Each structure stands twice: as structure tokens, then as C-alpha cells.
Amino acid sequence: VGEILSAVLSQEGINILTHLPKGSAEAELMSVVPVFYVFHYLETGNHWNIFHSDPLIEKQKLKKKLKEGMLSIMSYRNADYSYSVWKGGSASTWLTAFALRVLGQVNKYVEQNQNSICNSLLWLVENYQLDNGSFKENSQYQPIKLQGTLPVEARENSLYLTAFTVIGIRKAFDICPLVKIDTALIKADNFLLENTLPAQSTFTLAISAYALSLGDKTHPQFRSIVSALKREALVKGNPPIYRFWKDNLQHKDSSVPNTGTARMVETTAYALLTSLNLKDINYVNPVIKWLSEEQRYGGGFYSTQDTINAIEGLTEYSLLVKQLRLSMDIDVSYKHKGALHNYKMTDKNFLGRPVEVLLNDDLIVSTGFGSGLATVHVTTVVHK
Amino acid sequence: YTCNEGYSLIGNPVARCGEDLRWLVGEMHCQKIACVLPVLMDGIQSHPQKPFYTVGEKVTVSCSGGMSLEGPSAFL
Amino acid sequence: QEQTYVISAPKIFRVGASENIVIQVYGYTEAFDATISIKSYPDKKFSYSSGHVHLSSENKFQNSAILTIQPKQLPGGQNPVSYVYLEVVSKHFSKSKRMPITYDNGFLFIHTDKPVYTPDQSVKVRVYSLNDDLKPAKRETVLTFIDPEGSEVDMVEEIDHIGIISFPDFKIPSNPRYGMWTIKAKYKEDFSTTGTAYFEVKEYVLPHFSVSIEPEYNFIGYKNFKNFEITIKARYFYNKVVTEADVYITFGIREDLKDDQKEMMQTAMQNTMLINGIAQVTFDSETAVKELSYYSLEDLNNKYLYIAVTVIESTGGFSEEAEIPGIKYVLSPYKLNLVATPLFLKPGIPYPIKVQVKDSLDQLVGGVPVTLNAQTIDVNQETSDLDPSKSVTRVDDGVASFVLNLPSGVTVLEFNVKTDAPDLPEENQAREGYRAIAYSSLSQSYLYIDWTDNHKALLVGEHLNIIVTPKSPYIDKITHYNYLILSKGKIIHFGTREKFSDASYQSINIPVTQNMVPSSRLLVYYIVTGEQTAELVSDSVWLNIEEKCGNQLQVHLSPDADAYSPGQTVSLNMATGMDSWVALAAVDSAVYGVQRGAKKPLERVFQFLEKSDLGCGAGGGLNNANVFHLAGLTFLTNANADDSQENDEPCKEILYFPESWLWEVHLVPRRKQLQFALPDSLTTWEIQGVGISNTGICVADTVKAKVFKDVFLEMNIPYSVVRGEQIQLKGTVYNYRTSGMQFCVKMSAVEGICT
Amino acid sequence: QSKVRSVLRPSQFGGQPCTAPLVAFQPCIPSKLCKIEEADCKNKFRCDS
Amino acid sequence: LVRNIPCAVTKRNNLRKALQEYAAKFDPCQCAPCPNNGRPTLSGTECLCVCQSGTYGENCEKQSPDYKSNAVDGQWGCWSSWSTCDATYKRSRTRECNNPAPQRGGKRCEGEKRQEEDCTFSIMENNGQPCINDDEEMKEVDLPEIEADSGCPQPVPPENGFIRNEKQLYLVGEDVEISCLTGFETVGYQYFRCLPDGTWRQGDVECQRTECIKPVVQEVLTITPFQRLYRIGESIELTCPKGFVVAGPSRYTCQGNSWTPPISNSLTCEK
Ligand SMILES: *[C@@H]1O[C@H](CO)[C@@H](O[C@@H]2O[C@H](CO)[C@@H](O)[C@H](O)[C@H]2NC(C)=O)[C@H](O)[C@H]1NC(C)=O
């Protein structure tokens, strides 16, 4: 596994359960969607077994608050399975994609009725799938600035909208796989790639790279975008202790979170999520350490977006870390002939000895589900 | 702690006088430095039959008559 | 500032070591007690150890506390504790100092039965396992095998019951990577001690006889660039001269002792006769270089000579070859460095200097003249130049010796030592400039010892007697001086030495106890309260203790013979002064001959054990603090000194036909006599054993035993033969009878071979 | 470690002063280590200050 | 001013926090009001009145003969505590001009009678303040490290291959698994291994083409992409919406190593 970082939420997770009063401006949505993400973070499991240092979040209380938020989010759904904050407001493709993301998370414990989700997906694609860029946003009065965020609307906010819609679709698709949704994903990914070839502003590059990381992790131009992002990363120390991205003279000091820090934290969190999709732990570690500083203390604007992406990144890091934990009883055997050897591959016994393959038969290597990654090589030695 | 001569101390050798005025102990054990006789893999008879033999001491071994005993007549 | 204290401790606490910590207080009168304790850092919350020590006039107000950091009570985990608080508490003071701790506790001596192996062999291997105290460690241990590509190949672990860890025999993998394999040994879980050993895997064949190439010098200078002279000799491994061999000499250019393949020569390619074990060869390097090469002069030749030699026995089928991988051409043949020389002055007392003249191939030159220019300053830059002394090196050590009866006022000596071999110019006479500095006391208060810089080592159990003289404005206060004796990092003895009414101080009349036998160290100190300000005054010295084991295990073949017959029943008696375990091994001297450039498994074991000395140099220092640091100590005092200024720098001053058998372990209850039959291999066998006791390890004297017969056959079968090919297989029969007689060998072979 | 209290009302118009320390200090034994280290400048001359 | 010091930024932000607490604790607004338009000032423990010209005595209580202007007053009260976080999670506080209230045409209290701030909370378990300087991060691409450990630097992967685990340095004996880009398959031994000399035991391996992406030509419609990726000899239909052709075939296929496709432009046919 290499290096592991104890990046974690404080007891402030309890405040994010009891979070700032539910109500108008969808302060309820701002309160609950963090409750959901905290839910999933705790669902990583440590924060019920070990959290005794702090007050255990009561399972049932968390469940209750979860349920309340589910009902709320439903209540804001548009009748046509769009969404709006105002009852009579416009459909928002952006906020609907945000719903789709959150409701993609919830299923990990409480599935949302997939029919409604599928209808929302069909509405969003069928109404707004343009064929050169896609999902241009409808005439919603404004984004609620703390609920949404400010992309660089000065240039081609369709890039932002496409990225967010793609990400929402990604989080929904596994619960509503649809071939035409797949096709619209392909289209949007293609546009987002081709229009990210000019670097524009690095927030766009990071969010587009994350969208593609959800898609083809290994497309050549995807990797070229990644190699650009990794060029834009600032670092402290020759071996990077911290790595992050800035724009727009955010190097100015700010004692409190603000829209510039919001953009900073968002673009960094998207780069983190992209790198976690790459499973590049040696690259991710200094980003996680940077994020744990809470420089710009409180972080972002303390916007919903930055907070949600930050927690998503932290959960995905702790997940990938515990995935790489090596445990694999690799049993190797002949096809026709018997078993050969049974390496108890462990963080201690991580390297079984070379075994000469005596018998002249095909060799099948197998393992229990175990954990982590391993590699095994046979060499064959012969005379000519 | 230390074991008697001819024994190895296994586990943590130490104990600590706790604030309870009692010894917290390292779950320690004493194993004899002299090897036990090896398990009779098929009832093979150790002629110098003893409960213990030092490391490097010799045990002299044969099966019953007419059985070709596998392996050496000693393990040391 | 009358009431003062020193606590003195090892510079580093070894994890799990028993560390002896000694306290002296000055100017108290009422008997009082202190505690010395080791506490967690930074929080001081957890006491790793504590010792109550009573201090009284009865003790001359001196005591020590013995304190140990048990390895399990450290928090361990991801972060080792780096630092720890040493604390003192009394009615009169408290202070604490941040000691570093280190887990490098003990030694892991890996012994493999042989230095080299072929494919299709197994390496029998075992480890000797000891605390920082020489007791058997009894710690479970893991071997890590590493291939010549650096890949880890196996971990095998064993429980130590004895201090001898007989690991399972490691079969060489069914396809080895060739070259130097490595074994690394570590105690499991809780120590950093890391043993290491190597072996080479090669398709070798046992050589039939040794070939030794014996250049007069590993360098060529002005004298020899014209012509060089080089002996060659050969002996069969039963230690008799090779009667007749055809010798072919193959010179080459060289540029690098490490590795090169510079142009091989094609002139003066001497073919010659070895007779009665010896050939004498000479090489007019000037002629050969000028004739072959575009090089023509030694000025072009800050370089090296390669030579290979091959020799064919003039009436037989065994042929053998060897090389010297470089003889250094350089206008400066030697190099010069100081040895055992403090660079710290005891003014008025004689200042001895010893200087070593060394080859450009890192070898002792022997007898060479040297002259030492010396320049002194005493006070206020009052500068005087001394007459240049002259000396010659010891013919074995290459060490020249000097002594200067410097002025009692001398504060610094800067001195220039230059080789004085008249045949070399000064630009080629190895020469160096050095500076030596007085103790730099604050209150003109000093401590000196009479130690005569004895070139001979001290003999165990003799009463050493070193006279010590404090000098100060306040000598009538000092009343006594303290002393500390250091072995490894550890304060093994301490005490105090009263002023006679004579105003003369007790000498250090002490037995050099058996725990000192690895070269040891002494430090002496006092605090004088001055007019009102205290100063810690101290000095230290190096003491070599002549390397005598504790067990002194003596092992000998009771049926003493010049040579035994093959298969001779023999009685090997092992005797020891006490109950001891022993490990035994036998290896054919020809196997040491197999390795082109051999080394023994347990050479330099004692200097490896001495690596645990935290100090360096002959002693002394720029200050009390520096004296303590270079002695490998540290101290807590209110007497206006502290160590902290000085860095933890790495100071580096210089001061059946088996190939092996008998690979066995036994108890020797003081004495045991073991009889066995030798192999059929007619060779000298190098028999070695290692005693292991509570007193420590002792490698026995190596026994060489010749297996010889008046008549025998040997055949030069190669390591392997290509299938389906007709081959020519060559041998020779050897006659050591007084007389010739008719011999035949009838060969008999399996049907899988035809001839 | 610092212990501190607040003025509930200041003195004025000649009333009694507060007459006592607003902050007190107590020597601790610290739990963490100092992560502050000298940030020695790259190139400017470092005054002994 | 706090600049160019070790931990400059951390100390700066701490100092801002302290300044806000200090003002909130020792602002003179909490004084009882001075007579005769004395401006109160607070030196920690005592309020001292600054007298207007034409007022004198210890604390302005006696006026001069010309002062007139009796009870012409007014100065700010203290800030309220912050409101709780509102619908937009903004807190706010107010000050009431009431100390003293404006009188007889005396001034209204100066400036903004309210303040509003967006709420914020620290979220993560910060073990302690980092020492952050002003510019220590500013390096995006440092000097290449010395590489004193003499391991292996990153090898250049073969054509159409990539490194699963790109790093600056690979350990001796470490093997790096190459893998093939989205259209390609690995053939041969896909591991390089770091040799003690820093070479790579470079594998007898090369990425072979499995498939061809949807062709990268500038389009809006005038396309029917049956797939994102195509095997060689699979059709890709470039069908014009109106039967014209801009360039090349109205349908093509990845013939092998390439389509040999039109490089100048897509089939953005005339219509
Ligand atoms: C080489 O010599 C050995 C020793 O005599 C031969 O082995 C013996 O073979 C006979 C039968 O022919 C047995 O009765 C003996 O017990 C064997 N000796 C042992 C096992 O030590 C061997 O056959 C000879 N090989 C030849 C001549 O090719």
C-alpha cells in the first residue's frame, strides 16, 4: 500500500448532522446533502467501530435524518421529474444532476425508487441534449450561490454544465442503465474532451478531467489532459508534501473562506477525484495532506459544492486505501495435476519464495477474494 | 523474569507493579532449551529414549525389524 | 556556585540496554537522596525506569542508577520514539535532558558454510545472536535472502534458544541469477540490528593448486617505471610446491582499480618456467609502454598496470590462472595520514605523534623516513617555530612516531609532516599540515593524565595504573577527581580518587576486567567551584585491551599429525575454561582457493564488535563538553557547561569428496572430545569452531589439517560437459614415493558414457 | 498555558480600577512537539538577529 | 505588516482572529457616555474621555463660556451579537446609535448600523496549525531531484503503452507493469524491472492494436457513431444529412493501422 494518510472529519460531523437550519433557500438541502455525504463517510465503517473518542453518531438517528432528507429532496422534485428550488421555478439541469449525484450516493443504504430516477434522466437528456455541447441550462432565475457555485461563466459555461450533468448521470446510470443515456454520455464526453484541448481555466480542466475519469480512464487525450493538470499542480517541497492548484491570483491572502477559495477547493477536489480514479496513491497522498490543512480555514466559500466534493474525495481515498490493503491466499495449481502451492500473501508474508514448476502441465493460478493487488510471473527455460 | 537454566523465556520477560499494587505480567512462558524427542513419525523407536535431549545431542533410531526406516537414524 | 552536580550518561540510549547512569554532587554535606528516571517525551507522562540513589560522604557523594528502556513499554507503532527525557530529582535540584534512543541493540553475525557456491547446491547458514551485552540474545530472527538483481527471494525465521540460530538449508533456486547473492538478518519485531553476508554463485570447479602472483609493490614509481619485478609461486592445496609449470605472462594497461578493460599488451609477453614452486618475472615497463603504446612516460601514467598470469603444470592436465587487477603508476607513490593522534595538546606534557605511510592501494608502505616541522603559539599570539624533528616509519606498521616536549605555555601547535625519503621530491613526498589545540579551559583549570601513549595493548587482569594530575588556581579546593571507564557505549566502571596530604592524587589502580577486552576508553573529571563560579574540568583517553576472549576456547586434534590419510579416524578435543556451546565447521582450503580474491567468514569479528563504541579518537577535546561528546558521553550539569552545541556528527578517526562438512553444533561442558573420520578428499581442510557463552563469543584458533597420501590420482573433469559431444578429459597421477613404479588406472563408467 | 477573564464594565470617572491581572499563565508540560522550525531565507543576508 | 517571517501567513491569520476578539472585548462602545460630547476611549481597564475644544477639566465636565450647544449629542452603541445563520446562512449584527442617542440635532452615529457575514465552520480534524509561509508553494515544477539513492528513473513506455503506477523513482528490483492505451492490447512480457545499475530489463513486449476510436474529426451531426470504439474493418458511417460530401467517403472503416482518413477536414458536407 505504501503511505497511508489519516485524513478524517472532526466531531464537526455531528454538527453536519444537526447542520444549519433546514428551510428556505433550500437551507434544508444545504443541511441534508451534507448529512448524506457524512452518512456515506461514516458508512466507510471506521466511524462506528472506533469513533468512541468522540460521541458515536447513533445509527438510528442518522437513518432518521437520512429519511427526512430523502423525503425533502423528493418534495423539491419537479412533477415532470425535473427539479427546481422554487416550486414554480424553471427546471434546472444543473440542480437535477446534483440530485442525481446525491441519490446515486443514497442507494448505498437506502435506494431511491429507480423509476423516478429514470424518468428524471429521460426528461433531462430528451429536453436538453444538444449535439455540440449538451444540456445548456434553462432559464432558471439564478443559481443559489451557496447551493451552486460560480463557474467561469465568462466563457462557455456549457463546459461546466456538461461536466456536472455527465457526473450526475454517472452516479445515476448504475441505478438506471439506459443505452440512449450511454449514447448521450459518449457524446458529452467527446465534446468535453475536444473542447478541453485548449486549457482555458484550470477549474474547467480539472472538472472535465474528473468527468472523463468517470468515463474512459485510459483514452489517450484523457491522459494528455491529466498530464496537463499534473503540470499545473503547485507543490511545496522537492518531494511534494502538498500539491494543489490555484488560479485568478488566489495567492492573495484571505482570512476567511470566499468564492476564490471556493474555486480553489473545488478544482483541487476534482483533481483529487481524478487521481483517485487513476488510483495514483503516490500522487494523491500530498493532495490529501494539503486538503487536511484547511488552509483558508473553514474552506472554500464554505459552499455546499466544495464541501461535498471534499468529503467525496476523502471517502474515496479511504476506500482506495483499504482496497489496496494486501490480503490474498493465492493458490496456484496445475490444470490436470494437483495443487502446487498456496501463498498466504499478507502485509507480513508479502513475498512467497519462487517455486519451480516441476510438472509438465498447464498452470492455473487462483486466489480467494482477499484484498489488495499482487503480481505473479512464471519463467520458462528451454534449449534450442 | 528469567527461566531456570536449560530453559528459554518465551513472551515478554517483564512485569510492572501497577498502581493497583499488583504485577501486570507479559503472559510469559518457559520452554526447555533441551529438545523434546521428536514425534514418532511412524512409531520409529529412539534407542536412547529420553524425555529431553540437548540441541546437537544425538538420538539413535530404528524402526521395527525388517522395515526399511525412511530418513536418518538421528535428528539433532 | 558551590552546590553543583554532574549526571553522565551514554550519548545514546540503546533500546532494552541496561544503561548505568552515574551522578556526582559537589559541596553538599548532609546525606541526601536523589532519583534518576527515564520518562516519555515530550509529555514526561510515562516513566520507563527510575532509580533511587543515596548520596553521602560515605559514597563520597557518588552513586549510579542502572536504568533500562524495556522494548515493549515504548509506544512503538508507526513512529518510533526518537527522544526520551532523562530526569534527576533531589531536595536541591531537578533537571531533565532529551536523550535520543536507538533500537540498534545487539549483533547478528551471519555465517554461511562457504564463500561461494555452484548452481545445484544448498547454502547451510546460521546466525550468532547477541545483546549489546555479549550474552546470547535468544531473540527470534529472520533471514532475508536477496539475489544478485536485488530481488527478495525468501524470508525464513527461527526462534533462538542458544545464541546460535541454525536456519534451514537454503536450496539455491532451480535457476539462479549469477553473481553475488546477499543475506540480510534482522531480529523480528523490535530491533534495527541488521546483519549482512554475501556469497557468489558461479559454475566454478575446485582449483587443483593455488597460483599466487606476488608483485614487489602495488605501485610503480620512478624507481620501477624503468623496470618492475614480480614473483609468482604455486602450491598444491596440501601445502607442497608445484614442481613444474609452464608460465605464460599476459600484461595489460589499466586505469581503474574498480573496473576497466584498457588495452592488453602485446610485447614482453614472457613465457617462462616455474620450478620448485616459484617463477621469477620482471617487466621493463618503460620499454613495454614505449614500444607498444602511444604512451611513453610516467607523466602520462597517473594510471595502473594490469597483469594476468596463466600456468600449465609441465607434466599433467591441471592448469590455473590469476591476475593482479592494477599496480598504480603515480609520481606520488604513497599517501600519509595521522593515526591515534589526538590533535589536542597537554601543554608542558610530552605530545606524542604517530603518522602512517600508506600505499596508493590502501596498504602499509613499511619503512620510510619522515620529518615533522612544528610551529607553536603560547600566549597573546607570541609565536615560536620549533626545530623540525625527523623519524622513520616502523617497518611493519608503516607508522612513524614523534614526540614534542612543547612549552608549558603552548596554546596551539600547527605542524607540517612530510615524507623524507630523499629519492622523492617534496611534491611527491607525501606531506600534510595539521593543527592541534589546547583544552581551552575557562579558569586556567585543567586535568592531565600520565598515560604514556603505550603502543602495546594492556593485558587482561593486570592492574593498570595511570597517574592523574589536576592543575588549577584552586587545587586546594579540588580534593578529588572522578573517573569513568567506557566499554562499547556503556559506563562499565566509575569511581573517585582522593588527594593525598602530599597534594598528590590516587592513581587509577584498577584491574582491566574481562568486559574491557574490546578496546575501551577512560574519562576523568572534577568540578571546581572557583572563586564563586563552577567549572566542569575533564579529560579522556583511549585504552586498547588486547582482544583476549573470555572463553578462550582451545580446540585441537589430539592425534596430532603432519598429515592424516584420507578417511583417517581422528579425535578432535575441544577444551574450554567453562561450560560453553560450540559451533563447528569444516571447509576445503581449495574452496577458499575457488574465489578469485577470497576472504574468510569471521575475519575482523572483534573490530565489528567494537563498532558499538560511540566515541572516537584517542581522547581529549576542545572543552569539557567536547571531551564528553568525543568520549561518546553526555552530561547534565549546572556547572556552566552543556553538550547541546555539538552535532551528532559521524566521527571517523582511525585507531566422498565433500566441499564442506562437520557443520554441527554441540554443548561443550567445559571439555568434550569428538572423534570422526575425515573425507576422502586429499587436501588441507580448514577446520573452524566458535564458542558461545555468557562471557560472549570466541572464534577459536583455526585448525588447518593436511590430508595427504604418497600416491593418488586426480582428474580435471570440468563443471559440466556438453551432451552428445566427444570430449578430451585430462588428469595426472602424482608420485610422492621415493621411487618410480608401474601404475595403471582402470577407468569404469556407466553406459551413458562411451569412450 | 493562558487563563483569561473579561471586563464586565470598565472603571471610569474615578471608580476603583480593576486592580488585577486580566490574563494569567501557568507552566505546562506540553503534549505535542513544536512544528515551528527556522525558515532560513534562500539568498538575502541573514543578520544574526 | 506581518510579512517575510517564519509561518508568516499562519501568524497573520491568528493575529486577525485575535484582533477581532480584542476589539470585541475592549471596544470603547461599552463605556458609559462621556459628558459634553467627550469621545470615550478605553485603555484596557478604564474609559478616558477626550474633551472637545471648549470643554475642560479632568473629563470634560465643565464647559467653557462659549460652548452653548447643550445636550447636542449622539454616538454609537455596541454591536449586537451575530444573528444565527439565515436562509442564505448569513449571520448579521447591528448597533443602535443609542450611546448616547442623537439629541437636539446632534449627529446621528457614524457609519453602518449593521454587519452581515456568511457563516463558516472548520470541518476536518486539524491536529494543529501548519507553519505556512508567504510563497513556499509557488514552485509548480521544481529542479530535478539529485536522485542520490541511484534507483531507476521513470522509463519511457513503448508506443501505445502507459505506466500503471507512474512515479519519479522506482526501487531496485521493482518492476513496472506497462499497459496499452484504450485501443490496444499488450503482447509480450508487460513488466520492466529496475536493475541495480538503473537499467530496466526492458521487456520483450509491445502494444498491438485491438480497436480504433471513433475518428477525431470536427463535427456537429453529419455522423452516426454506432460505437465509441471500432475493430479494424468495422464500418464507421459518415452519412451527410443531405447526401452531399465535404471530404472523403460518406462511410469508411478502420482498415488496419489506420483509416488512412481525410486529414484536412471532416465530412461537413454542403447542404
Ligand atoms: C564404483 O564403486 C562403487 C563402490 O564399490 C560401486 O558401488 C558398489 O556396487 C556394488 C555392486 O556392483 C555394491 O554391492 C556395493 O554396495 C556398491 N558400493 C557402495 C554402494 O558403496 C559402483 O558400482 C562403482 N561404479 C562403477 C564401477 O561404475
CSV table of C-alpha atoms in Angstrom, one decimal, chain C residues 260-479:
chain,number,residue,atom,x,y,z
C,260,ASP,CA,38.3,-1.3,-16.7
C,261,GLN,CA,39.5,-3.2,-19.8
C,262,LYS,CA,42.2,-1.0,-21.0
C,263,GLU,CA,44.5,-2.1,-23.8
C,264,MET,CA,46.1,-5.5,-23.2
C,265,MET,CA,49.8,-5.7,-24.0
C,266,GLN,CA,51.4,-7.5,-27.0
C,267,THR,CA,55.1,-7.1,-26.1
C,268,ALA,CA,57.4,-8.6,-23.5
C,269,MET,CA,54.7,-11.3,-23.3
C,270,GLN,CA,57.0,-13.5,-21.3
C,271,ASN,CA,56.6,-17.3,-21.4
C,272,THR,CA,58.8,-18.8,-18.7
C,273,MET,CA,59.3,-21.8,-16.4
C,274,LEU,CA,58.1,-22.2,-12.8
C,275,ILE,CA,60.4,-24.5,-10.9
C,276,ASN,CA,60.3,-25.8,-7.3
C,277,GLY,CA,57.1,-23.8,-6.8
C,278,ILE,CA,58.4,-20.4,-8.0
C,279,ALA,CA,58.9,-18.4,-11.1
C,280,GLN,CA,60.6,-15.0,-11.1
C,281,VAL,CA,59.5,-12.4,-13.6
C,282,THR,CA,60.5,-8.8,-14.4
C,283,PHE,CA,58.8,-6.2,-16.6
C,284,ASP,CA,60.7,-3.2,-18.1
C,285,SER,CA,57.5,-1.1,-18.0
C,286,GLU,CA,59.3,1.8,-19.8
C,287,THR,CA,60.3,-0.5,-22.7
C,288,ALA,CA,56.9,-2.2,-23.0
C,289,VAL,CA,54.9,1.1,-22.8
C,290,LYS,CA,57.2,2.9,-25.2
C,291,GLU,CA,57.2,0.0,-27.7
C,292,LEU,CA,53.5,-0.9,-27.7
C,293,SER,CA,51.7,2.3,-26.8
C,294,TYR,CA,51.3,5.9,-27.7
C,295,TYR,CA,52.1,6.5,-24.0
C,296,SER,CA,55.8,7.0,-23.4
C,297,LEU,CA,56.3,8.5,-20.0
C,298,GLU,CA,55.2,8.1,-16.3
C,299,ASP,CA,54.0,11.7,-16.5
C,300,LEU,CA,51.4,10.3,-18.9
C,301,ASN,CA,50.9,7.4,-16.5
C,302,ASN,CA,48.9,8.5,-13.4
C,303,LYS,CA,47.4,5.2,-14.2
C,304,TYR,CA,47.7,1.4,-13.4
C,305,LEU,CA,49.3,-1.8,-14.7
C,306,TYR,CA,47.2,-4.9,-15.3
C,307,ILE,CA,48.8,-8.3,-15.3
C,308,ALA,CA,47.2,-11.7,-15.8
C,309,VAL,CA,49.2,-14.9,-15.4
C,310,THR,CA,48.3,-18.5,-16.5
C,311,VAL,CA,50.4,-21.5,-15.6
C,312,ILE,CA,50.2,-25.1,-17.1
C,313,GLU,CA,51.7,-27.9,-15.0
C,314,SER,CA,54.5,-29.1,-17.2
C,315,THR,CA,53.6,-32.8,-16.8
C,316,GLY,CA,49.9,-33.0,-16.2
C,317,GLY,CA,46.4,-31.8,-17.0
C,318,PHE,CA,45.7,-29.1,-14.4
C,319,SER,CA,46.2,-25.5,-15.4
C,320,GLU,CA,45.4,-22.4,-13.4
C,321,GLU,CA,45.4,-18.6,-13.8
C,322,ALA,CA,45.3,-15.5,-11.7
C,323,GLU,CA,45.6,-11.7,-12.0
C,324,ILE,CA,46.6,-8.5,-10.3
C,325,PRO,CA,43.9,-6.0,-11.2
C,326,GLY,CA,46.1,-3.0,-11.1
C,327,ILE,CA,49.6,-1.7,-10.0
C,328,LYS,CA,49.4,2.1,-9.6
C,329,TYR,CA,51.7,4.2,-11.6
C,330,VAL,CA,51.8,7.6,-9.8
C,331,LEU,CA,54.6,10.1,-9.2
C,332,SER,CA,53.5,10.2,-5.6
C,333,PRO,CA,53.5,6.5,-4.7
C,334,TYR,CA,52.5,6.9,-1.1
C,335,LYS,CA,49.8,8.7,0.9
C,336,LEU,CA,50.1,9.9,4.5
C,337,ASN,CA,47.6,10.2,7.4
C,338,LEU,CA,47.7,10.5,11.2
C,339,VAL,CA,46.8,7.6,13.4
C,340,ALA,CA,45.8,7.5,17.1
C,341,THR,CA,46.8,11.2,17.3
C,342,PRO,CA,44.6,13.4,19.5
C,343,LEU,CA,45.1,16.8,17.8
C,344,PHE,CA,44.6,18.1,21.4
C,345,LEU,CA,47.5,19.4,23.4
C,346,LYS,CA,48.5,18.7,27.0
C,347,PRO,CA,50.9,21.7,27.4
C,348,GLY,CA,54.2,21.0,29.0
C,349,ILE,CA,53.4,17.3,28.9
C,350,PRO,CA,55.1,15.5,26.0
C,351,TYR,CA,52.9,15.4,22.9
C,352,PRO,CA,53.5,12.2,21.0
C,353,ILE,CA,52.6,12.0,17.3
C,354,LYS,CA,52.2,8.9,15.2
C,355,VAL,CA,51.8,9.0,11.4
C,356,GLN,CA,51.2,6.2,8.9
C,357,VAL,CA,52.6,6.0,5.4
C,358,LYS,CA,50.2,4.1,3.1
C,359,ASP,CA,50.1,2.8,-0.4
C,360,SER,CA,48.0,4.2,-3.2
C,361,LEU,CA,46.4,0.8,-3.0
C,362,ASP,CA,45.4,1.4,0.7
C,363,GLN,CA,48.2,-0.7,2.1
C,364,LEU,CA,51.0,0.0,4.6
C,365,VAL,CA,54.3,1.1,3.0
C,366,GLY,CA,56.5,0.0,5.8
C,367,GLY,CA,59.9,1.6,6.4
C,368,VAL,CA,60.1,5.2,5.2
C,369,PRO,CA,61.7,8.3,6.5
C,370,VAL,CA,59.6,11.3,7.7
C,371,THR,CA,60.4,14.8,9.1
C,372,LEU,CA,57.9,16.8,11.1
C,373,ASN,CA,58.1,20.6,11.0
C,374,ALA,CA,56.4,22.2,14.1
C,375,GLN,CA,55.2,25.8,14.8
C,376,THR,CA,53.8,26.8,18.2
C,377,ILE,CA,51.9,29.7,19.8
C,378,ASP,CA,51.7,30.0,23.6
C,379,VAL,CA,50.1,33.3,24.6
C,380,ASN,CA,48.9,36.6,23.0
C,381,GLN,CA,50.0,35.2,19.6
C,382,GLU,CA,53.6,35.0,20.9
C,383,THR,CA,54.8,32.8,18.0
C,384,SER,CA,57.8,30.5,18.0
C,385,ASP,CA,58.9,27.9,15.5
C,386,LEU,CA,60.3,24.6,16.7
C,387,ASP,CA,63.2,22.7,15.1
C,388,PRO,CA,62.0,20.2,12.6
C,389,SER,CA,62.2,16.7,14.0
C,390,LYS,CA,62.9,13.6,11.8
C,391,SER,CA,62.0,9.9,12.2
C,392,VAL,CA,61.4,6.8,10.2
C,393,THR,CA,58.4,4.5,10.0
C,394,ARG,CA,58.0,1.1,11.6
C,395,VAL,CA,58.9,-1.5,9.0
C,396,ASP,CA,55.6,-3.4,9.5
C,397,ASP,CA,53.1,-0.8,10.5
C,398,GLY,CA,54.4,2.0,8.3
C,399,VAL,CA,53.9,4.2,11.4
C,400,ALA,CA,56.5,6.9,12.2
C,401,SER,CA,56.5,8.2,15.7
C,402,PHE,CA,57.4,11.6,17.1
C,403,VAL,CA,57.2,13.4,20.4
C,404,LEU,CA,57.4,17.2,21.2
C,405,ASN,CA,58.2,18.5,24.7
C,406,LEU,CA,56.1,21.6,24.0
C,407,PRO,CA,56.3,24.6,26.2
C,408,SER,CA,54.2,24.7,29.3
C,409,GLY,CA,52.7,27.9,27.9
C,410,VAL,CA,51.8,26.4,24.5
C,411,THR,CA,48.2,27.1,23.4
C,412,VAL,CA,48.2,25.7,19.9
C,413,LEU,CA,50.6,23.7,17.7
C,414,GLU,CA,50.4,23.8,13.9
C,415,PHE,CA,52.9,21.3,12.5
C,416,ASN,CA,53.7,20.1,9.0
C,417,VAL,CA,54.7,16.4,8.5
C,418,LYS,CA,56.4,15.5,5.2
C,419,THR,CA,57.8,12.2,3.9
C,420,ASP,CA,61.6,12.4,3.9
C,421,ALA,CA,62.6,9.6,1.5
C,422,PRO,CA,65.3,11.6,-0.3
C,423,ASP,CA,64.6,9.8,-3.6
C,424,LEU,CA,61.2,11.6,-3.9
C,425,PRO,CA,60.8,15.3,-4.4
C,426,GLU,CA,58.6,17.2,-1.9
C,427,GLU,CA,55.8,17.3,-4.5
C,428,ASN,CA,55.9,13.5,-4.3
C,429,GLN,CA,57.0,13.0,-0.7
C,430,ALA,CA,53.6,12.6,1.0
C,431,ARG,CA,53.2,15.6,3.3
C,432,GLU,CA,50.4,17.1,5.4
C,433,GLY,CA,49.7,20.1,7.6
C,434,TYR,CA,47.8,19.8,10.9
C,435,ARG,CA,46.7,21.8,13.8
C,436,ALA,CA,46.5,20.8,17.5
C,437,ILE,CA,44.7,22.9,20.1
C,438,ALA,CA,44.9,23.2,23.9
C,439,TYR,CA,42.0,22.2,26.1
C,440,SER,CA,40.8,25.9,26.3
C,441,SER,CA,39.8,25.9,30.0
C,442,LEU,CA,37.9,29.0,31.2
C,443,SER,CA,39.5,29.3,34.6
C,444,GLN,CA,43.0,28.0,33.6
C,445,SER,CA,41.9,24.8,35.3
C,446,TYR,CA,43.0,21.6,33.6
C,447,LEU,CA,43.2,17.9,34.1
C,448,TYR,CA,46.0,15.8,32.6
C,449,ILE,CA,46.9,12.1,32.8
C,450,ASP,CA,50.3,10.5,32.7
C,451,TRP,CA,49.3,7.9,30.1
C,452,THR,CA,52.4,7.2,28.1
C,453,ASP,CA,50.5,6.5,24.8
C,454,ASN,CA,51.6,2.9,25.0
C,455,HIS,CA,51.8,1.3,21.6
C,456,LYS,CA,51.4,-2.2,23.2
C,457,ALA,CA,47.9,-3.1,24.4
C,458,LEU,CA,47.0,-3.8,28.0
C,459,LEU,CA,46.9,-7.4,29.2
C,460,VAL,CA,43.7,-8.6,30.7
C,461,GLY,CA,43.5,-8.8,34.5
C,462,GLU,CA,46.7,-6.8,35.1
C,463,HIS,CA,46.4,-3.8,37.4
C,464,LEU,CA,46.5,-0.8,35.2
C,465,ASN,CA,48.0,2.2,37.0
C,466,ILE,CA,47.5,5.7,35.4
C,467,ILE,CA,48.7,8.8,37.3
C,468,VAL,CA,46.4,11.8,37.0
C,469,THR,CA,47.3,15.5,37.8
C,470,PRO,CA,44.7,18.2,38.1
C,471,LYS,CA,46.2,21.7,37.8
C,472,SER,CA,44.2,24.9,38.6
C,473,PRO,CA,44.3,28.1,40.6
C,474,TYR,CA,42.1,26.3,43.1
C,475,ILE,CA,43.8,23.0,43.5
C,476,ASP,CA,43.3,23.1,47.3
C,477,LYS,CA,39.6,23.0,46.7
C,478,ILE,CA,39.5,20.1,44.2
C,479,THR,CA,40.1,17.4,46.9
